[model samples]
Target chain A: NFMLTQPPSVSESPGKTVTISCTRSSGSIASNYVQWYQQRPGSSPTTVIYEDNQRPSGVPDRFSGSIDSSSNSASLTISGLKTEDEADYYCQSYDSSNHVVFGGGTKLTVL
Target chain B: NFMLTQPPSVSESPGKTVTISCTRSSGSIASNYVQWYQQRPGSSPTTVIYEDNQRPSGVPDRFSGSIDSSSNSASLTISGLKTEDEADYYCQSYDSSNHVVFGGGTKLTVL
Candidate 1:
């Protein structure tokens, strides 16, 4: 089984951008697709990016995702950060057997 | 996008069994595969069931899942429950457009 490690916290000024990373410990990050989720306090998570870089219908274009096969990592990059975007972000992927794996989640603060 | 509904909270005595349900708002319950997750306070969620009834590698046998075609919903059944199992549980499935739909989540309390 693989594990995903992420930074504990990140902060960016309003209107600025920040990227939270998820590094997979065992397999190639490109072996499967990765999805990013946003969870506010006292709310269920919502998917912001699915299948690596694809954004869902209502998600703003500012929310994006990327894969760095060379670094064995995935990133959720938010451009033009807003106070509303302040929340915990988690990244997820599936293993070879189609098992789900998750990142520890990163707490994002808007300054 | 279809929504998945779940009870806000549920409780059962320790060592007893309990089932959480995730009902789909539209389309057949079998239209797409459902997955279950367990999340403790201030931590990332772990997958208990993936691709419908398939359990992830490290999950205990006491955790099981099944799709209830009769009700257009999915079920996560935990048997021989322990106090450690108390947490927020959620179910997710992709829609026809391959967009992920997640239940609001159910809070399970072990009495």
Candidate 2:
């Protein structure tokens, strides 16, 4: 089964922005639209980025997203990291078949 | 902000079934589409239900969802539960404006 792939782990400085990437085999990325979620330990996932570019209500401006159709990859960047920002991030995409799929998720640790 | 409310916790026995509820504020649940997610410890969240009652791909038949438009509530049932099924479940709502709101989450413990 072709699955969405994301970085297994990540660590970064508090002020430095880090980007996590989500890549799919073939059918996942469509027209550069994807959804991004943030899940802190012991909590449910929260929608931070959507449609590959829009941020949900109340999300800080530090979160941004972009997608590249040519490479079938979507990227989410969190700027000005805070300790609270440390969490797992995942990307999701839906196909014409209505099969919603998700990336493995990247764990972000602030140091 | 009006939010989704889920039972703080639950406990069940193996082979038994349980139903968890997600209730929303009048503004959040009225004619809004609901989504459900599953998250275990040390893992990314996975989509279990979307569009109120549609199951995602590869989701087991044991998981099911229903919505009550009049009462502004959503329910999820998991049957033939196993120890591995113990995890946090959340309900979400998305409006046309792309504002996504999530339930606090229900912790399922199988003993």
Candidate 3:
């Protein structure tokens, strides 16, 4: 299975936008769908995007996902970032054989 | 989404075994496959068991999973516990609508 690499931290002002990338070490990024999770402090993660781009119920429309075949990466984009949106974000995907991998979580700081 | 309830914390001595339970709130435990993830402090969560009880390639045999229908819960049992195994464990599953649900997470302390 491949590994997903993500930036360690990102900072943006409230009402701005931030996009975090998860680059796969091997295999096409589009070959398998990616899911994004948000974990607040002292809380378990919740799915924000699943099946690549579908937002789960209750997730704001400002959160979105996309895959770039050209870059062999998937991205989680948060628009209109709020202080509450500051949390750790992780990207998850499975290989052809169902081996799962999760990106090194990225911490978003709303300054 | 149905909630997955887990104990907040547990403590056991090294060389012993401990089982963390994740109970389903409103549905049969067998309705969907369960996965267990381990998160070391300051790190991303990784799969220890998936598809109910299948361990990933690099996961040790000491870690295992099971479901108890009568109890409506999933179990993650770690044997021959070591200090390295001390971490937070979470149980995850998807509902019929395919929305993902994760437990509150259990902190395993090896003493």
Candidate 4:
């Protein structure tokens, strides 16, 4: 079983982009596809990014992700952040065994 | 593009068995890994069933899952349902392109 660790909180100005990173324990970040999810207050979570970079249908391009295989870390960057972007973000990784693991979720606060 | 159709609601008395089904369009259910998540109020969604039938550690044995490619449906069944099991259940499917899709989610209530 692989565990994902993410930062607890990230704060940034309204116009500046911020990155939240998720580190996997034993899996190669490249082979294990990563996805990011955003959940606003009192709403269902939506898929923000899939496969570490591709956004789901109808998802805005502002939400993007990148993988750093060298460091075993995947990051989600929200560009041109707005007040509504304040929410919790979670990153997930999947393996060939069909097992998917999720991070603890990072809280993004807009200042 | 794949759409996952799920029942909006289901209810059953305690000790009874209940199953929630998710049907996919155009996507092969057998090849796509289906994962089920349980989300209660004020708590993060937890993976209840993964890889079609594998349960994460600490998950109860009563929770089981199966896939039916012929019908393009995957199901999660809970035997001897408990009151604590009342919550929203979501079915997630991922494609070879790493496009992850989530169902509308089913809400369960225990009597």
Candidate 5:
């Protein structure tokens, strides 16, 4: 019943590291595969990380994802942030009840 | 990376039934689960259908999804459409290469 939760927004200077967290309250994060998405204004969300830390083709290595099952949370880490990384970030996971869920999303800003 | 294709927009009367299609080019729709999401303006996306045709708890029965593996396409149908049904619809699935992918999204209008 509880969907994923994320920070509303985050800001970091260029070349700094920023981490966005997605918390799950009703389900176990360790048993499910968590995915991360990036959405730019006026464009559809693109898959940046899947199955926790795997990146799709063309995605930069600076972006990574990890899940802390003990804390029931997943995180997206952006290292060496660039202007191009400024966008909305979201996390998704499949529930044990056979439903998919998405986070509220976090707006990342490169200052 | 493989991408899903969807029509840019669709329109239908409030009482009519409308179906939105998502076409997959390179993945085997039969082997993977297809999910659909509804996103209202300025809000987070809600999962309407998962594992092809199973609706989540609290989701109206009027909403349904189906996949045609032969045609490599999936569809979301909204029966007895209402004003609130107007929103952006997106289809997502696991790609053969072990990544998740989303459609470009289709905007549905209740006329």
Candidate 6:
């Protein structure tokens, strides 16, 4: 089974930039597309990134995603963080077993 | 753009069976796969069923998924439900525009 590890929490001030990393093991990151999602309290999750770096409609350009094949990791970077961007972020990837797996999730705090 | 709809919540007694419905428009469900996810409080979502009814490793047989093309809807059925089965359920599918879409989610309660 593939496992994804991420930082438990990250904090940054408004207007600053923050990057959350998702490390993959027992799977090939380059062989699969990485996806990202955002979930606010008491709300359902919304897809922010898919197919590695494609953003959905209405999503701001301040949010970007990328993968590092050498490190077997994927990252979501938020530029000019806003209070509304403070939420739980998750990374997903397809595994060799033809299953989808998600990271533990990272909580972002905008100060 | 394609949209998926699901009931906000559903409740059933222990050992009973419950079905959560996910209705989709003229998009991915017609040609691609419909996936189901389970999310517990403060935990990342886990894929319970993919490609309609295929369960990943370690998932109990009590959980099953199906899609109705005529109605453009997907469903998740859980039989012999237990207290631990209580969680938020989400249905996901790819859109015609090559983007992944998610439902609003349904909260399952065991009485």
Query: Mind sharing the TM-score for model 6?
Result: 0.93
Off by over 4 Å in 6: none
lDDT pick, better of 2 and 3:
3
Q: What is the lDDT of residue B78 in candidate 1?
A: 97
For each candidate, give the TM-score of chain B.
0.97, 0.91, 0.98, 0.96, 0.95, 0.95
**Reference-based TM-score of each model:** 0.91, 0.85, 0.93, 0.82, 0.87, 0.93
lDDT of each prediction vs. the true structure?
0.91, 0.83, 0.92, 0.86, 0.87, 0.90
Give a tens-digit lDDT track for model 2, residues A1-111: 346899989899888899999998876476436889898776767889988899876999999998887888889989998988988898887665544677988989999
TM-score of chain A of each: 0.97, 0.92, 0.97, 0.94, 0.95, 0.96
Model 2 chain A: lowest-lDDT 10 consecutive positions: A93-102
lDDT of 3 at B86: 91
lDDT (Cα, tens digit) per residue for candidate 3, span B7-110: 99999999999999999999799999999999988799988999999998889999999999789999999999999999999999889976678999999999
Candidate ranking under DockQ, highest first, comes to: 1, 3, 6, 5, 2, 4
Overall local distance difference test of candidate 1: 0.91
lDDT of candidate 6 over B9-105, digit per residue (tens)? 9999999999999998655466768899999998999889999999887999999998887788999999999999999999988765656788999
Clashing pairs in 1: none
lDDT of 5 by residue, A30-88 (tens): 87889898888756788899889998779999999987857899999999989999988
In model 5, state the lDDT of residue B41: 68
Model 6 lDDT, residue A27, Cα: 60
Q: Report the number of the highest-DockQ candidate.
A: 1
User: What digit string (tens of lDDT, one per residue) describes model 5 on residues B4-63?
Assistant: 899989999989999999998775777688889998865677889988998877999999
Best by lDDT: 3
- Candidate 5 at residue A84, lDDT? 94
Candidate 2: lDDT of A46? Answer: 84
lDDT of 6 by residue, A1-111 (tens): 779999999999999999999998776788888899999987788889988899988999999999886888999999998999999999988876556789999999899
Distance from true location, Cα of B109 in model 6, Å = 1.3
Can you write out model 2's per-residue Cα lDDT over B1-111, one digit (the tens) per residue?
Answer: 557889989999999999999987756465677888898877766889888788877999899999775767899999999998899998887656555678999999999
**How well does candidate 3 match the true structure in TM-score terms?**
0.93
- lDDT assessment of candidate 6: 0.90
